[PDB]
Design a protein around this nucleic acid. Sequence first.
RNA 1: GCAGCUUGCUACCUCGAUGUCGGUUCUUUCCAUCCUGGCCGUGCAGCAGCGGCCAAGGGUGAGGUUGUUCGCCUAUUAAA
RNA 2: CCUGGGGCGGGACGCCCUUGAAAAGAUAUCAAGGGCGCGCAAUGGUUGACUCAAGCGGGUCGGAAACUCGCUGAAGAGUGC
RNA 3: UCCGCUGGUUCCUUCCGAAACAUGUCGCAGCAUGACCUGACUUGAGAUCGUCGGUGGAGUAGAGCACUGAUUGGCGAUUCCGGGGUCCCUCGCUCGCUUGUCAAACUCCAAACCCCCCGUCAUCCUAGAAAGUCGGAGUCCGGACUGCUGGGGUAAGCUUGUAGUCCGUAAGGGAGACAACCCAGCCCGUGGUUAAGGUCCCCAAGUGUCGACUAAGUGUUAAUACUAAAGGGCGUCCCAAGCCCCAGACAGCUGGAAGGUUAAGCACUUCAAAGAGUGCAGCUCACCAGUCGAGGUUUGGGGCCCCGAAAAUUGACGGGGCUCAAGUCGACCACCGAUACCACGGAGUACCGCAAGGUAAUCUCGUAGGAAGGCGUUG
RNA 4: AUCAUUCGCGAGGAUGUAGUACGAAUGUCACUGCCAGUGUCGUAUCUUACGUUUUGAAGAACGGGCCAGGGAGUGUAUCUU
Lengths: 153, 96, 57, 159
Amino acid sequence: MYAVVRLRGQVNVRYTIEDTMKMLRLHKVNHCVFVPENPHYKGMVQKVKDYVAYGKIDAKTLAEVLENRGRLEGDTRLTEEYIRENTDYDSIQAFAEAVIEGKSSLKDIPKLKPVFRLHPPRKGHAGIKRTVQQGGVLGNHDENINVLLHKMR
Amino acid sequence: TNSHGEKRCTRYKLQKTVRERGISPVSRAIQEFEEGQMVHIDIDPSVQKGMPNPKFQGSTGKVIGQRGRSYVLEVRSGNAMKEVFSLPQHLKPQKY
Amino acid sequence: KSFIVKGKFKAGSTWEKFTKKIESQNEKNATDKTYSIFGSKHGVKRSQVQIESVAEE
Amino acid sequence: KPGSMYRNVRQRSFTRRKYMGGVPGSQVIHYDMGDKANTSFPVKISLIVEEKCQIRHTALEAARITANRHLVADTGKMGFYMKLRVYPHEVIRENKSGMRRAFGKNVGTAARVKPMQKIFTVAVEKQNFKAAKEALWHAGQKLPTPCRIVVDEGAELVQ
RNA sequence: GCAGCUUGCUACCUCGAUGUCGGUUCUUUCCAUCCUGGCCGUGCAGCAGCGGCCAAGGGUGAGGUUGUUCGCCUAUUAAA
RNA sequence: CCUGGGGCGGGACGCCCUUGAAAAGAUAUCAAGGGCGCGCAAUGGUUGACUCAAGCGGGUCGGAAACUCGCUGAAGAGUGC
RNA sequence: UCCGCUGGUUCCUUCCGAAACAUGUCGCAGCAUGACCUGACUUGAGAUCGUCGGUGGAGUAGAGCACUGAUUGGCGAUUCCGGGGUCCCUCGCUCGCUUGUCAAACUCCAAACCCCCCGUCAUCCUAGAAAGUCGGAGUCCGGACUGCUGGGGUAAGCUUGUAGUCCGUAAGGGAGACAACCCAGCCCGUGGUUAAGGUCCCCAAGUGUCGACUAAGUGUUAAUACUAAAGGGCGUCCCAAGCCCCAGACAGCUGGAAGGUUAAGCACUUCAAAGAGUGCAGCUCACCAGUCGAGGUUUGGGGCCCCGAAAAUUGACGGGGCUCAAGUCGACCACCGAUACCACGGAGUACCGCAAGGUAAUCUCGUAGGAAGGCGUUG
RNA sequence: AUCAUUCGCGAGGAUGUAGUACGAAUGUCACUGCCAGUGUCGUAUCUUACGUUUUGAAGAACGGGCCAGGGAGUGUAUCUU
Ligand SMILES: [Mg+2]
Ligand SMILES: [Mg+2]
Ligand SMILES: [Mg+2]
Ligand SMILES: [Mg+2]
Ligand SMILES: [Mg+2]
Ligand SMILES: [Mg+2]
Ligand SMILES: [Mg+2]
Ligand SMILES: [Mg+2]
């Protein structure tokens, strides 16, 4: 499961890349979306590598992301009670485990927004002018996206 | 000044490869096409009759009718739909 | 706490071997000092420096 | 007209001489010097250029003259074989008024050379290696590019 | 390669005007130094040259033609 | 009228092809190569029969210049410009 | 009078928001038509700005000589068409084998982008897809940055194109100032954290950490119209490889350059140790012996610095100043720092709902201009 | 913050203390008589006027010395929505 977070703005960005972002539902910086691992989404995330950061999120990171930055319709925070009344699992942690194990989805939750408006990264990040392999933050973090997601908790 | 003729800038659009120059395969000229079938426009430069523009070279046309030997194609040129008359020698079916 | 470092690096348009004897507190610090010294003496980043081994001596 | 004018490569290749008019030919006379028969020279070195530059035919002729004279005075007339690999194929045209109808007349030819492309190849004996190398050094001083010598044959024969 | 001190190229500023050449007057500036000061080389005997380096404190004038700039010519002058 | 100010020069003032033009399309300059303002009752249509350019070989002053026979020959010819 | 030419054209808010381009024009300071913007209406279910796979178009970069043309030698024959001192024989073209270069009007080859169509995912869509009809225009002086070695040009803050994004019409934060360079697209107030960039002082936060380099005040200048080259350096710091090398080299200190030749040196039988000879006929090196007693020399590839390096009012790393740095290089840590992001409260807008009200990550910038709603004077 | 453990060459990081004490704001109880505002001055940050021609205006481009009043989409006919 790619965890794609936007880290650069929409100024001086080409229309194809900006529409790629818009179909990914990433209109502003510090916005995260969780998407499956099919080749279609892999190509879409590859097209916007210079303006986002993506990786393979683990279950604990997604659990804390749902617990601290999940919003329903009307801008209402997600909690444990809504999860238990609209899913089969014991808490947000078990639902995150199910989502990582592929037998669940984020669309299982009724009314849940597909965009996680995250906080800016605590103690900054590595920079938006170099990729991950150049010492920056853009591009593919692999499993190290969870460190960046943790610092943007 | 430059010209505005129909064959303008078709040095390689309307050129045949070295080992397909000469007579073409005659089976390409009797390929019947159905209504609504998608066919590729790949112009045969040897057949000088019933040819579309070079500007439609490489466009997929939907067959909508027949006008004798040639076929009626609904071709797309940028943002407009065009009706392009082409004989079967210049068309080629799309395979799935 | 002395080390031998083997490898090659991009000395301009070419690649050159090296077995520069480097000493430090441990092996990772030896590798870091290898990268730092080559970035100093030749102005090349760590992508242009390849270390084949770090031999404890 | 200094070589800095027709030096940088920012234009496409103007070489089809059947669609142009009256190119003044190159002053470069020969392209082989020395022993043109002895293929048994063990130590062979080449002068390579390390930029993308257009060498005028007059520059090539001056470099060839200085290198050939140095090699003849160093290793004798038949103790070396020196090859100028590149022909000047590009036609250099100057806008000889103002900028109206600016496509100029051909005022000479030149050779467009890529980075690391050998200009002169010199084959010499073991003892005449240093003289050939130094003459090739003098040859590159008459060229508009930074040039470095590279050894073709007998790298172990020298060191 | 440098300078932007000649002619070009360009059309960025100015056409509800930035008074357009040359001279004169007065002040200043750069050194790529003509003389004055200090050195180095010489195919420097001396005298007098020739070439180069440092150096902008001072000096660098008077006259004939030409509207001239420039340039020529005259006699001085350390140099003009 | 266009015009690296205007004028002199030129017509990039109508039509046609190659490049420019960055492998769909489009793409400017007084950009580069240029051409056209016609010719033909056959230099047109169709059917049949053949294959051309240029070499090598044989043939008598018919020379290394003619015409003729064999071989090579997907085109190196011809198709008005 | 007329003018396509100049100047001026008077209140507020809200919604949306361009074009400086094509064709024709006695057309080039103008206009019409189309693209682009806006408002309304009809229509009734798909649309493609994006991804992945496939059926097709490639003839550009690159590459190459297989065609068209160029282009360099060598080797062996055109017994022939040709040039020269019994056509005795010289002999350049021409044809093959092996080399050396090319093309914008060359291609046996040949990408990455890209374009048409199909399937899938994705997004938009009955709160109205694509299509259609009508009302209103503005607009056809554009410019810049990043690419295309774009074309031309000696080059140009030159001129003329193309793809994207900007300024125009773009705030706020930062580069010293900066139309268009980076963050950023922005309703109001508060709190927090970050972006770009910076942390010696001017100035909030580092006289921060590790490993080296620079000795020149070099530098303290991302992009750039704002930044000097060729050439050279036994300046200094590195990597690698030949050669001599504790069976004793390199550089210094002791006996000789004695046989020879005056082949007028400077126009050997055989010895470890003496030439047809380095130097101001003795005056001097190359060379063997001894000697301190250990590295020496050559080449190649690199980093920084230096010479090359001269301009005009006194002056510009932004200034002070800075030398194991306050400079350069390879990494790292912590903090500072926006109106961005998060949160809270509030305003406006869009659509839906009978209404209460609901939704908005997928609403809030704005020139020419379209549309809507209001304030004011006189009657 | 402090303290403890551990890692890190080091600057520092991780873990726990602790999502604790705090924290915009929303209420309530004391306490106090000034506060909002107005004029001027100073300190800190930001801004080179307005309209126009302009690709680009603070321009060494054009307009205004200042103040008051006057000063620019109106009617007929016709066509269209
Ligand atoms: Mg005119
Ligand atoms: Mg090419
Ligand atoms: Mg930009
Ligand atoms: Mg804009
Ligand atoms: Mg700004
Ligand atoms: Mg408006
Ligand atoms: Mg304007
Ligand atoms: Mg009034």
